[PDB]
Amino acid sequence: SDHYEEEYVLGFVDKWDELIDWESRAESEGDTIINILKERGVKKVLDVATGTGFNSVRLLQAGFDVVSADGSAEMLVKAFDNARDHGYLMRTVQADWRWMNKDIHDKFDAIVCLGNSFTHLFDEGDRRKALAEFYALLKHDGVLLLDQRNYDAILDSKHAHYYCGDTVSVYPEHVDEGLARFKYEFSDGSVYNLNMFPLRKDYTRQLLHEVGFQEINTLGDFKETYKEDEPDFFLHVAEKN
């Protein structure tokens, strides 16, 4: 059922937050995103993939005005209570990427679409539609920050990637040009298997260019515990202009 697919992922993010505390994670991940926004003079930020709220809370802590959107009401409840626990009032809004301005009536200096969330779309029409909705919600001089795993390295290898020391391993069980299924195994024995679309770096860049973004800088980001020559993530910094 749709309820189970949703409950499965809610269980996954529960487990991630259970075993990986946000302070350790913040000190580990660093402040590159915050500084990018600061250097641009960003004030208003829309988080379009809030999840359990880590990125939104970090931005609130940094002093940004943040609106926290997610397709999932249940995610937003977790995110709100996590923000609350850290001493912030989150502004949550349930929203589908295909109609983002249904209940969002402001425009923003920046949008963040992080957590490798853009890969959850398996339809190209949905990809273009989502990017267009993001584009429309940006002020004339606004920016979209959108990240993704590095699938190029896998498509062109077969070993696990670890995060937060050895708290979780991520193993590509199946990868072809249309699908990547990863096995997530946590230090307590918990296992989750998740599907995502293996976006090539240049394909994502091309989609962004095609919906109207004017300059895209893609940064390599090394997040995993045991570093390789290739980054395990990319961050696209797409300026609207």
Automatic annotation (TrEMBL):
Tell me which stretches of the chain form a coiled coil. Answer: none
- Biological processes annotated in GO: methylation; one-carbon metabolic process; protein homotetramerization; regulation of gluconeogenesis; S-adenosylhomocysteine metabolic process; S-adenosylmethionine metabolic process; sarcosine metabolic process
Q: Does the keyword S-adenosyl-L-methionine apply?
A: yes
Q: What keywords are assigned to this protein? A: Methyltransferase, S-adenosyl-L-methionine, Transferase
- The protein's superkingdom reads Archaea
GO CC terms, sorted: cytosol
Q: Which Pfam families match?
A: Methyltransf_25
Q: Which residues bind S-adenosyl-L-methionine?
A: R25, D70, D96, W97
Q: Does the keyword Methyltransferase apply?
A: yes
Question: Any idea which positions bind S-adenosyl-L-homocysteine?
Answer: R25, D70, D96, W97
Q: Which Gene3D superfamilies match?
A: Glycine N-methyltransferase, chain A, domain 1 (3.30.46.10), Vaccinia Virus protein VP39 (3.40.50.150)
Tell me one GO molecular function of this protein: identical protein binding
Give residue ranges for domain Methyltransferase. 45-142
Return the SUPFAM superfamilies for the record: S-adenosyl-L-methionine-dependent methyltransferases
- Its protein name is Class I SAM-dependent methyltransferase
Q: What gene codes for this chain?
A: gsmt
